[PDB]
């Protein structure tokens, strides 16, 4: 539902990379190049930031019924 | 590489990424046991479910 703060297999911290990754992609880079620039060399860490879906924006779209 | 001994695996292996889905049939929702609990009304036998 959010970026997983760690690689399921390695342990490399990945959570902090997400906003920078979106910045890079908006900066008109091919996702592979931008990812390598962010420094993910193994494909067991590349997968998460490459094929992660962010739903938290969808969930935030609603109003807080609890206040 | 074996993680117990450390010796290399004799035969190379197939590996790689794929996609898995854990199904709704969790184990916690199936295991149960009975020891002389309730009984039906019409007949003196154990309940069901």
């Amino acid at each position: 539902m959010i970026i997983p703060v760690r690689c399921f297999t390695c342990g490399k911290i990945v959570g902090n990379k997400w906003e920078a990754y979106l910045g890079l992609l908006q900066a008109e880079y091919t996702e592979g190049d931008a990812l390598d620039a962010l420094g993910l060399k193994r494909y067991c860490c590349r997968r998460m930031l490459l094929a992660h879906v962010d739903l938290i924006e969808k969930l935030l779209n609603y109003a807080p019924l609890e206040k | 590489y074996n993680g117990f001994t450390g010796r290399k695996i004799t035969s190379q292996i197939f590996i790689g990424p794929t996609y898995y889905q854990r199904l709704k049939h969790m184990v916690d929702d199936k295991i149960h046991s009975r020891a002389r609990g309730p009984i039906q009304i019409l007949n003196r036998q154990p309940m069901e479910g």
Partner: protein
């Protein structure tokens, strides 16, 4: 117990490599299928 413990070291796998043959055998496959196909086509023509 013992044979599984030896399998632990030897390793037994299955992979895409085992599902692929050489090009010469592929060519033999193509030749066989083509010969059979044209033969059955000729049989169809004879029936016609």
């Amino acid at each position: 117990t013992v044979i599984n413990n030896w399998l632990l070291i030897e390793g037994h796998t299955i992979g895409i490599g085992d599902s692929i043959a050489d090009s010469k055998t592929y060519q033999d496959i193509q030749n066989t299928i083509k010969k059979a196909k044209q033969d059955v086509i000729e049989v169809i023509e004879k029936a016609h």
